[PDB]
Ligand SMILES: CCn1c(-c2cccnc2[C@H](C)OC)c2c3cc(ccc31)-c1csc(n1)C[C@H](NC(=O)[C@H]1C[C@@H]1C)C(=O)N1CCC[C@H](N1)C(=O)OCC(C)(C)C2
């Protein structure tokens with residue numbers, strides 16, 4: 001049977017966690033905002049010649065439940081850390097999620113990918129260079145995406161699988 | 169204080185009637201929104217809409233009659249209206265309270281608590297409580313799940329003012 005990868009998508013409310021995941025799984029985008037409680041998805045893919053199963057946990061951004069993330073962080077193998085390039089606050093919130101994952105897993109070596117979503121939008125407030133520098137400071141890849149145009153969507157998830165692969 | 173009712177159906181099969189007291193004496197604008205939406209008198213309202221999020225141990229949420237998918241809803245004052253006050257608390261099962269997407273975004277979505285939900289105090293406007301039919305709300309719970317997706321369509325087949 002094929003290797004399964006437990007991916008978790010995290011980030012502030014409205015950054016595009018669900019829109020990214022539903023583009024991956026269903027190949028469609030809607031501008032409507034349906035706030036997530038918690039959703040799980042499965043998808044078979046081929047990455048660098050190798051077939052595998054993505055088990056994706058799409059989490060809630062709600063800060064009021066920030067104390068209920070520990071179990072899914074323990075269980076997850078890799079994390080897609082999403083902010084929106086037109087929302088400076090979501091970029092600040094990113095540092096918090098990374099520190100929280102590191103603390104909960106008790107490791108400096110957690111597979112993750114920094115994702116700057118909504119790159120189709122003109123109202124950009126977070127510079128490409130800002131995110132590359134943060135990613136570099138973390139030792140993780142940075143990918144620009146648009147759930148709306150599909151730019152970078154596969155690449156973001158597939159890169160995260162590569163990060164998990166190198167860790168194992 | 170006005171009283172309204174919902175006749176609940178499950179996949180079109182009748183379940184029973186839930187009635188609510190609306191605290192017009194304490195939150196008149198929010199009570200009036202819910203009353204008017206229950207009668208349909210503005211030309212739109214709850215009749216036919218579903219409970220799209222049911223989480224046993226917590227609440228039953230509904231009221232999206234514009235998009236029928238959990239994302240919509242509108243008030244009788246415009247798409248959204250401000251938080252009237254936070255005088256009343258989420259004290260236990262039966263409390264009726266407005267759903268929202270942050271401060272001052274009340275539309276038509278609402279929830280009925282099936283337990284005390286105190287951490288929602290000061291964030292969601294409480295404006296009513298179940299008067300009769302709490303056993304109908306309790307019976308709705310088994311059609312829900314941990315993340316709230318329902319296993320049968322739970323609809324407001326009819327509603328009005330008593
Ligand atoms: C961390 C997990 N988690 C929990 C929780 C906490 C502790 C233990 N277990 C859980 C669940 C079962 O673990 C999977 C919650 C919860 C709530 C949210 C996101 C995640 C949540 C969430 C997303 S958006 C919102 N909260 C407010 C939401 N807004 C909209 O729907 C806007 C569209 C319309 C206009 C809204 O007003 N309500 C009306 C009040 C109840 C509220 N929904 C809701 O569903 O609470 C679910 C509840 C009660 C279980 C809390």
Ligand SMILES: Nc1nc2c(ncn2[C@@H]2O[C@H](COP(=O)(O)OP(=O)(O)NP(=O)(O)O)[C@@H](O)[C@H]2O)c(=O)[nH]1
Pocket residue numbers: 011012013014015016017018019020030031032033034035036037059060061062117118119120121145146147148149
């Ligand atoms: N233009 C544009 N809009 C996007 C993009 N990704 C998401 N959105 C929009 O942003 C809003 C929120 O997206 P959503 O995926 O629900 O965000 P979330 O991070 O899942 N939110 P939550 O934590 O509450 O579940 C929606 O209106 C959605 O259409 C994107 O790449 N471009």
Ligand SMILES: [Mg+2]
Pocket residue numbers: 017018019034035036058059060
């Ligand atoms: Mg989401």
